[PDB]
Amino acid sequence: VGQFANFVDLLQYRAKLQARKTVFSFLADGEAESAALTYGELDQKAQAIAAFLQANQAQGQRALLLYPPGLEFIGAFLGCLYAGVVAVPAYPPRPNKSFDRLHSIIQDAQAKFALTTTELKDKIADRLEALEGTDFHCLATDQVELISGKNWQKPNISGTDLAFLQYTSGSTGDPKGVMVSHHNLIHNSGLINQGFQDTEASMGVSWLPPYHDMGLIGGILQPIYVGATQILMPPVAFLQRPFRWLKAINDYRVSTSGAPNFAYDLCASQITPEQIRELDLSCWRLAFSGAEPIRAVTLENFAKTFATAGFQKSAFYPCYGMAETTLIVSGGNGAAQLPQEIIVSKQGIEANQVRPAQETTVTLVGSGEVIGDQIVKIVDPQALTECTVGEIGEVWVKGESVAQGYWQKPDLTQQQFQGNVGAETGFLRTGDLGFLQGGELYITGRLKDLLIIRGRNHYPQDIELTVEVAHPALRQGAGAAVSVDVNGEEQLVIVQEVERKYARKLNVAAVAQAIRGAIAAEHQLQPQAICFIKPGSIPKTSSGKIRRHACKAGFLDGSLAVVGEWQ
Ligand SMILES: CCCCCCCCCCCCCCCCCC(=O)OP(=O)(O)OC[C@H]1O[C@@H](n2cnc3c(N)ncnc32)[C@H](O)[C@@H]1O
Ligand SMILES: [Mg+2]
């Protein structure tokens, strides 16, 4: 299997060798199975959709993929690879929402096609025509006869051929289209397997959105890469009842599942003890965490809440990666049993130094060891010189999982993908800050979001964590720490959601004072302003990631859903 150059060849081969084995089973509610596909049916479905796409002149073109989580998305995604169509997966349109985000992806990709379901086509086709013109083709793929796969013309695919555009979340700016080659997919899939060590016998469950990163390349392609079986549920199923993820792990004897850090909090907070007694997670061998800061307290609370259910803390698999690196860059615990943690000086971190306290401490979790034949260096993002050990800088990645660049963004591509340092060339600039320690990669934050106030560096996620716990009225996961210019000086500004139960009785003065005291004590900052906003109103990506630049923009233009303000 490791001699396959691309996923079309590999799926066709698994469709022959394991024709009758279920590849995906979808639980639409997160509990009851509602649909399934074998390797045989997945491949036949891909060819039928591919042939439909080729007849519709989509080969070489970009096509939006607009699907609910489910098996129609997967077929349509593999249909694009089979057909030679540059797939652009995206979150589907929702009722009552504008198509601004999707129109902007269509504009940036210069896509002439949207692949979707019959139900969605009937609701969105005429709106898409209004936005995109008669030339734009909205195609439904869920009623294609499987007989049509006989007309499929296999393209001559090489690894360097572009496979799909992976749009970034939009956390720090507008989603940029990452050009993922067929070879990026194969190479990274091998990276994921070198670290996960899954086999044909593995069993996975994933609730992650299938549209991007972990849920796509990890949740869809990796089961296929290794010949395994993957159970799938929609994200909303888990967010509404976190029990269902761990219950799925229990019922199917899942070996490999994972989620961002917040999902582990959600299980530990929302799953009752009697539910815990229903669980046997002794089979859960690899519990990966990525897409967000990995928090030591989060790991410990999960391991302690579910120890009686047989979850072992050594199952935790920290990992780091991005769209620009296809997916995984680093992972694992090395030779340690548990995720490696360091206790370092907090003020050193604010000074780009990793060292013990000589002053307060922060506990940092490693995001794993760099997998395989790739290279990671820590580079000063301004002087473009390599850091020595104990120094924090921008994480630079060189390797064959590094994507081809950004779609139709030659300037930014040259800037971010042609990283030179010392005698080195060809490095990807991740835009993440971090450092190497003990063979592991630690990530401290995003360069673009870094707060530089009063001569010191501050990580926004550290301050937001301080603001959330400062008062019961404030919603966890729904705040932003941003810096604004006050007469030529950067100053802290807080945009923070309040709980709905607290939105009618809110004491702005008292709550703001609680926030000021917590920031003063933990960070030695004084906020210029605290903006209290309605629950659900903070600008987020479709994936839920806070758009910190947009909170600052909305604070500066008065367009936030304000409920209170202190200044
Ligand atoms: C039966 C067999 C089944 C088998 C299933 C197989 C599953 C395998 C897939 C699991 C591998 C996921 C590897 C992690 C990628 C993250 C995605 C992403 O994050 O992609 P992206 O949208 O581009 O966001 C980019 C920005 O997210 C920030 N970030 C990411 N990881 C961070 C961290 N560990 N710590 C701190 N920050 C972090 C960071 O800032 C980054 O630059
Ligand atoms: Mg990014």
UniProtKB/TrEMBL annotation:
Residues reported in the UniProt entry to bind AMP: 291, 319, 323, 367, 432, 545
UniProt keyword annotations, A-Z: Nucleotide-binding
Protein name: Polyketide synthase
Superkingdom in the source lineage: Bacteria
